[PDB]
Amino acid sequence: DPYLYPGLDIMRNRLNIHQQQRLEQAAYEMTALRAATIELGPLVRGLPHLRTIHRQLYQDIFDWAGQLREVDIPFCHFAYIEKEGNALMQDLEEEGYLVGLEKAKFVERLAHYYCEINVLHPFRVGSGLAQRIFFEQLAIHAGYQLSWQGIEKEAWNQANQSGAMGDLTALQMIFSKVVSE
Amino acid sequence: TDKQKSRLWELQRNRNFQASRRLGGVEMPLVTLTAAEALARLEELRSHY
């Protein structure tokens, strides 16, 4: 695992912290403040923009921030991430980034695109965070808005687990509460 | 709508980030700072490690 320091079970990091608890704390704090500076970004958005989001979030913690995952650690084998992520994003473009859809269709397509990017798992760390920012922003460009406020941890996971298996029903139910306006 | 969209982003993004992080099981304080205030705080946190 080339992301780790040679001797240890800790991720190589720009603050050179060698304790697990401390690195986690500083990463939560610094990501939190970086998120508070991320701008909405363009309507036209692909893999580059997702990467851009992850660079901004993690630039203080990791020298590889904004780069696609380089090990396998269901999730896409690392060397195919760019190919399938560009394919996925080309398709989103063809549907005009979901802009102009009635609620129920929007929910249905958001669930689909969330599930596919999630399974792709494009970053070594921070995929879910960068992902949800990308769709918060996409939703706003399409006339909608996302709120994750009411959602139990265990339901979110289960719903992503069955989505990766081809049943998007629980992720759809979650998204019809998360989407509004 | 492009300025309406950006302003809606700015007003929700931190609330989102807190609730998105709580999805993965971690409760952090809400960030109430503006971008420029948060940029200054980042340089302070870098000094502290």
Numbering used by the authors:
A (entry chain A): 10 to 82, 88 to 195
B (entry chain B): 5 to 53
Reproduce, without paraphrasing, sentences from the article in which this PDB structure was first reported.
The E.coli Fic protein EcFicT forms a tight complex with its cognate antitoxin EcFicA. EcFicT adopts the conserved Fic fold, but with a distinct active site signature motif and an additional hydrophobic binding pocket in the vicinity of the active site loop. EcFicA forms two parallel α-helices that tightly embrace EcFicT. According to this classification, EcFicT belongs to class I with the inhibitory helix provided by EcFicA, a small protein coded immediately upstream of the ecficT gene.
